[PDB]
């Protein structure tokens, strides 16, 4: 679940939760679900998103921050691996998290000292805060692989494997070359590709694949998967040159790409 | 402060905080003021008292429990020893506490796992629930000194040194005799005296001793100390027989009494 999936969740949850009192946050894991008691007995005023985090604005200056990791998603009905429940006046949201990567943080509005990942997040890719000047600066400030850097979310929040892979293919750039090795012309292509890929994905309700671990609360599948050029298409023809898409796993991280179009491969 | 001082605080504060939004509980001592963030951003629905505890009932099923201790008190103006502040929309309450014995507890309504005393407190002395049969039975089961049973609070919630001493004098009973040694007639006198002294102390707004430690919220002193017969009057004339009031200490525990009038005197 990346920015497009989480943004879709935010948009779909608003109609179902705005105005409702969050009666209780039921769970049995104070290590992963921190200070949730702070959020109880408060009316939900809004649902915001920062990166991949979901932030429920609660009456009285409090926020319930949700980290939807890599499985953790909210459902309208309980599941065998539901680890927490947000009990509202009219309905209940169940936190489906098979691999316990999810997190919840009851905090005073804006106080993210205990949420390091949220604290260092770069600007919102689809906002005016994500400007090319700063983007270019950040790239030249790093010698690490271009892909890896994008995943750190310091240059752009919410970017994961799917969209980094699709943006790199769109911009025709190797995911493995040094970030600072990019020319202004190239960096500009990636800047645009990243923004266009993310925007399109949001418009199509995100991507929905096989395992489909992550599901939207209404169960409506996304449609950006129909635009995937490389992600999840290993062995299939590159949509540009027909060459079989390659999937290389480096440092435990899998990356889809076309060796020909992205200047890599054997 | 004992039941009378705490009750006076409750009565004085209610007209000032009822219906007000508790915006924040300001302090920098999480050791003594625990989970206060739980109470923030909630309207104050009531200010209850159980024994010597003050409880602010907050919208959303939360309670801010306050234990004053030896020198704790809420003031309408800040003091050199203010340890915390309850910032309301219309005003601010300051928790004055020179000796730092006071404590604050933010808790879900009813969850007194951290304040067990609050769960075992006996009936409220000035209530229909405080009955003689139970009181008498409670005394007949103890070989411990009468006064110790008045301080237990499982028998008489809210009673401390001042009112135990004063009740015992009014009832003309030895503070040091075994609780069980009392006859039913003696027990009935102590029962009545205890209730009258507390009721009277409440009427006069609590007791402001020599240390001038206790003061109502606005700063005005209580006025029951003028009715004191033996407390804080060691060496002064008993008001009934003119003999010098004595003060026996038991392991850091003073007890004022008239030897002659209260069946003692060696
Ligand atoms: Zn290709
Ligand atoms: Zn006397």
CB A23 within 8 A of CB A16: no
Q: Kindly report each contact of residues A27-30 with a partner whose C-beta sits within 8 Å and lies 24 or more positions away, as own/partner.
A: A27/A83, A27/A84, A27/A85, A27/A95, A27/A104, A29/A83, A29/A84, A29/A100
Pair A247, A137 in one domain: yes
Of A46, A78, A91, A82, the residue nearest A64 (C-alpha) = A46
Let me know if residue B250 belongs to a domain. Answer: yes
Query: How far, in Å, CA of A55 to CA of B71, rounded?
Result: 42
Residue whose tokens read 């102590």: B190
Orientation angle between helical segments B132-140 and B184-203, nearest 10 degrees: 120
**Active-site choice (A196, A247, A253, A264):** A253
* Cβ burial, residue B62 (10 Å; 0-12/13-18/19+): buried
CB A35 within 8 A of CB A59: no
Pair A92, A138 in one domain: no
Q: Six-digit token pair at B245?
A: 């009031």
CB A34 within 8 A of CB A103: yes
Report how many Cβ contacts below 8 Å link chain A to chain B.
31
Looking up residue B231, the CATH number of its domain turns out to be 1.10.8.50
Pair B3, B85 in one domain: yes
Pair A135, A112 in one domain: no
Note the Cα A151 to chain centre separation in Å: 10
Total domains in the fold of chain A:
2
**Three-state SS across A202-223?**
HHCCCCCCCCCCCCCCCCCCCC
- Tell me the HSE value of A257 on the side-chain side, using a 13 A CA sphere: 27
Q: Which domain holds residue A145?
A: 121-258
Pair B137, B250 in one domain: yes
DSSP three-state, residue B42: strand
Let me know if residue A72 belongs to a domain. Answer: yes
Let me know if residue B153 belongs to a domain. Answer: yes
Interface check for B111 against chain A (CB to CB < 8 A): the answer is: no
> Torsion over CA of A36, A40, A46 and A50, rounded to 10 degrees?
0
From chain A, the residues in CB contact with B42 under 8 A are: 41, 60
DSSP three-state, residue B139: helix
Whether A40 sits inside 8 A of B60 (CB atoms) is yes
Interface check for B42 against chain A (CB to CB < 8 A): the answer is: yes
* Cβ burial, residue A84 (10 Å; 0-12/13-18/19+): buried
DSSP three-state, residue B67: strand
Let me know if residue B265 belongs to a domain. Answer: no
CB A180 within 8 A of CB A141: yes
DSSP assignment string, B147-195: HHHHHHSSSSTT--HHHHHHHHHHTT--SSSBGGG--HHHHHHHHHHHH
DSSP three-state, residue A201: helix
Let me know if residue B147 belongs to a domain. Answer: yes
* Cβ burial, residue B240 (10 Å; 0-12/13-18/19+): middle
Looking up residue B105, the CATH number of its domain turns out to be 3.20.190.10
Pair A101, A131 in one domain: no
Instruction: Tell me how far CA of residue B73 lies from CA of A90, B17, B49, B124, B217, in angstroms.
Output: 42, 16, 14, 21, 8
CB A197 within 8 A of CB A161: no
Let me know if residue B266 belongs to a domain. Answer: no
Q: Can you name the residues that pair with A54 across neighbouring β-strands?
A: A49, A66
Q: Identify the domain boundary among A99, A120, A141.
A: A120
Q: For residue B262, how far is its CA from the centre of ligand 2 (angstroms)?
A: 7
Pair A93, A128 in one domain: no
Query: How far, in Å, CA of A171 to CA of A261, rounded?
Result: 9
Query: How far, in Å, CA of A252 to CA of A260, rounded?
Result: 23
Q: Which residues does B73 contact at the CB level (< 8 Å), separation at least 6?
A: B1, B5, B9, B95, B96, B97, B214, B215, B217
Nearest to B41 among A21, A37, A59 (CB): A59
Q: Which residues does A189 contact at the CB level (< 8 Å), separation at least 6?
A: A171, A172, A173
Residue whose tokens read 């040091």: B176
Pair B72, B46 in one domain: yes
Q: Six-digit token pair at A199?
A: 């925007």
User: Residue B75: which H helix or E strand, with range?
Assistant: strand B73-75
Query: How far, in Å, CA of A202 to CA of A109, rounded?
Result: 26
Pair A133, A243 in one domain: yes
CB B18 within 8 A of CB B44: yes
Could you list the beta-strand ranges (E) of chain A.
Answer: 21-27, 33-34, 42-50, 53-58, 62-67, 73-75, 82-88, 92-96, 103-108, 246-250, 253-257
Q: Which residues does B210 contact at the CB level (< 8 Å), separation at least 6?
A: B232
Let me know if residue A185 belongs to a domain. Answer: yes
CB A189 within 8 A of CB A172: yes
Pair B37, B142 in one domain: no
CB A153 within 8 A of CB A123: no
Query: How far, in Å, CA of A144 to CA of A35, rounded?
Result: 37
Q: For residue B238, how far is its CA from the centre of ligand 2 (angstroms)?
A: 5
**What is the number of other CB atoms lying within 10 angstroms of the CB of residue A197?**
26
Pair B134, B116 in one domain: no
Query: How far, in Å, CA of A8 to CA of B212, rounded?
Result: 63
**Active-site choice (A52, A189, A195, A215):** A52
Q: Identify the domain boundary among B120, B152, B186.
A: B120
Q: Identify the domain boundary among A120, A145, A170.
A: A120
Instruction: Tell me how far CA of residue A167 lies from CA of A163, A250, B20, B151, B217, in angstroms.
Output: 6, 18, 53, 74, 65
Let me know if residue A265 belongs to a domain. Answer: no
Pair A112, A155 in one domain: no
Query: How far, in Å, CA of A37 to CA of B58, rounded?
Result: 14
Q: For residue B199, how far is its CA from the centre of ligand 2 (angstroms)?
A: 23
Query: How far, in Å, CA of B11 to CA of B5, rounded?
Result: 10
Query: How far, in Å, CA of B225 to CA of B96, rounded?
Result: 21
Q: In what order do the strands lie in the sheet with A82-88?
A: A33-34, A103-108, A62-67, A53-58, A42-50, A21-27, A82-88, A92-96, A73-75
């Amino acid at each position: 679940p990346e920015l497009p999936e989480v943004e879709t969740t935010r948009r779909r949850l608003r109609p179902l939760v705005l105005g409702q009192t969050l009666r209780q946050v039921v769970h049995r894991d104070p290590a992963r679900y921190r200070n949730t008691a702070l959020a109880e007995g408060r009316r939900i005023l809004e649902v915001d998103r920062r990166g991949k985090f979901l932030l429920f604005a609660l009456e009285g200056g409090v926020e319930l921050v949700a980290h939807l990791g890599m499985t953790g998603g909210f459902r309208l009905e309980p599941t065998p691996h539901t680890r927490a429940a947000l009990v509202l006046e009219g309905r209940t949201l169940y936190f489906h998290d098979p691999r316990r990567f999810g997190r919840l943080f009851g905090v005073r509005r804006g106080d993210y000292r205990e949420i390091p990942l949220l604290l260092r997040l770069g600007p919102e890719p689809l906002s005016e805060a994500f400007a090319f000047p700063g983007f270019f600066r950040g790239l030249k400030e790093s010698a690490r692989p271009l892909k890896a850097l994008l995943l750190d979310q310091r240059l752009a929040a919410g970017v994961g494997n799917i969209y980094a892979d699709e943006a790199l293919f769109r911009a025709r750039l190797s995911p493995f070359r040094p970030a600072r090795s990019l020319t202004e012309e190239e960096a500009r292509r990636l800047y645009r590709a990243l923004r266009e890929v993310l925007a399109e994905a949001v418009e199509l309700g995100g991507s929905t694949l096989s395992d489909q671990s992550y599901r939207q609360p209404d169960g409506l599948p996304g449609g950006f998967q129909t635009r995937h050029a490389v992600y999840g298409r290993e062995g299939l023809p590159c949509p540009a040159c027909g060459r079989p898409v390659e999937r290389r796993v480096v440092a435990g991280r899998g990356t889809h790409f076309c060796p020909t179009c992205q200047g890599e491969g054997p």
